[PDB]
Design a protein around this ligand. Structure first.
Ligand SMILES: C[C@@H]1O[C@@H](O[C@H]2[C@H](O[C@H]3[C@H](O)[C@@H](O)[C@@H](O)O[C@@H]3CO)O[C@H](CO)[C@H](O)[C@@H]2O)[C@@H](O)[C@H](O)[C@@H]1O
Ligand SMILES: C[C@@H]1O[C@@H](O[C@H]2[C@H](O[C@H]3[C@H](O)[C@@H](O)[C@@H](O)O[C@@H]3CO)O[C@H](CO)[C@H](O)[C@@H]2O)[C@@H](O)[C@H](O)[C@@H]1O
Ligand SMILES: C[C@@H]1O[C@@H](O[C@H]2[C@H](O[C@H]3[C@H](O)[C@@H](O)[C@@H](O)O[C@@H]3CO)O[C@H](CO)[C@H](O)[C@@H]2O)[C@@H](O)[C@H](O)[C@@H]1O
Lengths: 310, 315
C-alpha cells in the first residue's frame, strides 16, 4: 500500500488554489457563520479532484473562449458576451458531471484581470488586450451554460469572433456594491438554478477544533480594503495528491508543522480525507510562525484523536 | 539512493517555467543561432535550482517592491522607478550569488502586466483599511534602467498620475506590450541585470546538443500581446512542475543523461524518445523545426540512465 506523503514546501514555496497568489499566512476563523464549500483547491487525500478543481496554476479563475458581441448591462462600463470552452480549448460539454468548466471562479465578487485576444485570421495575426471585470454574481455569469459576460473600461477595441483569454489579477473593488464574499458560490447556470456536482462542504466535527486555511491577500483595482482568499490546501498539495494517489488508511492524517532549522514541532493538525485541515485553536487570525515551516505527515489516526492545543 | 522520476503530467497539465502560461506544444528549432542560456526554469536533475529560478508559479516574471518616484524617460508614457525586494518581501542582498532577484524576467522585451499597490497607512474613516490602485504597466527589460541586481527597476504606465510613491507595489505579468521592431523582443537575449555595460554573473550555463543529429526540445507557450501583430512564443527547457518535482526529490543523477520516452497512455505506445541531460534540458534526434504534433495526453516517462554512446531513435 503506497505510503501517503505531502510535499516538503515551506509556506513561502506554496501558492493558493483559489486565486493565482502566493500563500501569505496560515489563518483560522472559528466563528465563521458561512458554509465553507469552495470548489477550487478541492482534492481528496487519495488524489480525486473535486468541484471545479484542475491542475494548472494558470487555470485558476481563468477563462478561454470567444467574444460573441457587445451587450448592454446596468453595470458601469462596456460589456461583452463571451462563450467559454474548457481551458484546453475543447468545447465545454454541459452534461459532464462538474459544476462548471474547471478553473471557473468559486466566489462572489468583481474579478479584475486582463482580456486578451489573438485573431485567427492573418502573415501575422492582430492582437489586443484590455483590463476587464467579471461580476460572478451577475445573472449573466453562466459558465455552466457555456458563456459569461465581462466589462471593460475600453469602449470599443474588443473583437467579436476571435479567441479570447482572461488572465485574473485581483478584485475590482470590495465596496458594498461589488458583492465580494469568498464563501458565496456563484450560480453557475444562472440566477434561480441549483448548482450541481459540488465538492462537499467542510467543517470541524470535534469540539475545540476549527478549520485552518492557507490565506493569500488579493490585489485591488481601487478603493479601500485588504481582501483575502482562503484555500483549504495549496495548489501544490492538489498537484502532489493527484500524482501520488496514495490510499487513505483512515479518515484523518495527523500532520505536524515543523521548524526544520530545529526539528521542533510548532503545532499539529488533522488533515481530513476530503482534503482540509483542522486545528485545536479558539481564536481567529493569523498563525504567527516562520515561513520556512512546513507540514510533515506523521501517521494515520482515529477520528477521535485529540489534537494538542495550538 | 532514490530512483529518479518525472511527474506523470500530460502536456495539458504543465505550465511554462519562464512566463505564467500553460504549455501549448513541444517544439524544436535546430537552426537557432542564438546561445540558449535562459535563467528561469533551470534545475539540475538532482534538484539544484540555478539562475533566477524559484518554485512559485506566481513568482515567474513577477516583482515586489515600492515605487520611489516618477522619473523622466525619452520614451512615450509615464515612467516610475520602483525598488525591488525578494518575492518573499525580505530585502534583496546584491551580494548573493544569483544573477538578480529570483523570478526576474530572463529575456529582452516589453513585458506587459498590472502594477498594483496596497498602501501601508490605513484610514480610520474607512474602517482602518488601506487605499489601493492598479494600472496596466510595461517593463522594458532591455532598458538601461532595468537594474534588478542593483535593487530597482523602471516601469511605464498609460496612467499619468495615479501611482503612489512610498507604497508597497506588485507587478503581475500578463504578456508582452508589442513585438514590433522597436520593442526588442528576443527570448534568448538576457537582460543586463546590473545595467548597461555590466557583466551578468552567477548565470545558469548555456545548453546545447553534443551529438550529431540532435537538437534541443522545448516546451513552448504562446504569450499574449497588448497590441500589434504577431504570435510570440516563450520556450522553456523544462516546465515549472518538473522544476518543482526535481527540487523535491533530489534524486542522485547516475549518469549524464536520462533516457525518457514520450508515451501515449491510451495505447501505451512510445511516440518518440529523448535525452534528458543532467543540467536540465532535453534533446531529440530531429532535423526539422516546428511543433511536435502529438496528443496532449502524452507524457514523458523515465526509462533508464544511459552512457555517452547512446544514439536516439529519430522522431
Ligand atoms: C481609494 C482610491 O481608489 C481609487 O480611486 C478611484 C475610484 O475608485 C473607487 C472604486 O472604483 C469604487 O469601486 C470604490 O471602491 O471606491 C473607490 C474610491 O474609494 O474611482 C474613481 C472613478 O470613479 C477614480 O478612478 C479614482 O481614482 C484609486 O485610483 C486612488 O488612488 C485611491 O487609492
Ligand atoms: C531613481 C533614479 O531615477 C531616475 O532619475 C530621476 C532622478 O532621480 C534622482 C533621485 O531623486 C535622487 O534621490 C538621487 O538618487 O539622484 C537621482 C538621479 O538624479 O530624479 C529626477 C527628478 O526630476 C528625475 O525624476 C530623474 O528621472 C534615473 O535616471 C536614475 O538612474 C535613478 O534610477
Ligand atoms: C493590430 C492592432 O493593435 C492594436 O492597435 C493599437 C495600437 O497598437 C500598436 C502598438 O502600440 C505598437 O507597439 C505596434 O505593435 O503597433 C500596434 C498597432 O498595430 O496602438 C494605438 C495607440 O497608439 C491604439 O491603441 C490601437 O488600438 C489593437 O488595439 C487593435 O485592435 C489591433 O489588433
Amino acid at each position: 500500500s503506497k505510503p501517503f506523503t505531502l510535499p516538503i514546501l515551506t509556506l513561502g514555496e506554496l501558492t493558493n488554489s483559489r486565486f493565482p497568489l502566493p500563500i501569505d499566512v496560515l489563518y483560522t476563523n472559528p466563528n465563521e457563520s458561512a458554509i465553507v464549500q469552495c470548489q477550487n483547491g478541492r482534492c481528496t487525500l487519495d488524489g480525486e479532484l473535486q468541484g471545479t478543481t484542475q491542475l494548472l496554476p494558470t487555470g485558476i479563475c481563468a477563462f478561454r473562449g470567444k467574444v460573441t458581441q457587445q451587450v448592454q448591462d446596468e453595470h458601469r462600463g462596456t460589456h461583452w458576451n463571451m462563450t467559454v470552452t474548457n481551458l484546453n480549448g475543447t468545447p465545454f460539454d454541459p452534461t459532464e458531471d462538474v459544476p462548471a468548466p474547471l478553473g471557473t471562479p468559486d466566489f462572489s465578487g468583481q474579478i479584475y484581470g486582463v482580456i486578451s485576444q489573438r485573431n485567427t485570421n492573418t502573415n501575422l495575426p492582430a492582437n489586443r488586450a484590455h483590463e476587464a471585470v467579471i461580476a460572478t454574481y451577475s445573472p449573466k455569469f453562466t459558465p455552466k451554460l457555456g458563456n459569461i459576460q465581462f466589462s471593460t473600461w475600453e469602449t470599443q477595441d474588443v473583437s467579436s469572433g476571435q479567441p479570447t483569454k482572461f488572465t485574473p489579477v485581483g478584485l475590482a473593488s470590495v465596496d458594498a456594491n461589488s458583492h465580494f464574499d469568498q464563501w458565496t458560490l456563484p450560480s453557475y447556470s444562472g440566477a434561480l438554478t441549483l448548482n450541481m456536482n459540488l465538492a462537499p462542504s467542510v467543517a470541524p466535527v470535534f469540539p475545540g477544533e476549527c478549520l485552518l486555511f492557507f490565506r493569500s491577500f488579493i490585489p485591488l483595482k481601487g478603493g479601500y480594503g485588504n481582501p483575502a482568499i482562503d484555500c483549504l490546501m495549496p495548489q501544490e498539495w492538489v498537484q502532489h495528491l493527484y500524482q501520488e494517489s496514495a490510499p487513505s488508511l483512515s479518515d484523518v492524517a495527523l500532520v505536524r508543522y515543523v521548524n526544520p532549522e530545529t526539528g521542533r514541532t510548532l503545532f499539529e493538525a488533522k488533515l481530513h480525507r476530503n482534503g482540509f485541515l483542522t486545528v485545536a485553536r479558539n481564536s481567529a487570525g493569523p498563525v504567527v510562525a516562520p515561513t520556512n515551516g512546513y507540514f510533515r505527515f506523521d501517521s494515520w489516526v482515529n477520528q477521535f484523536y485529540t489534537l494538542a492545543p495550538m
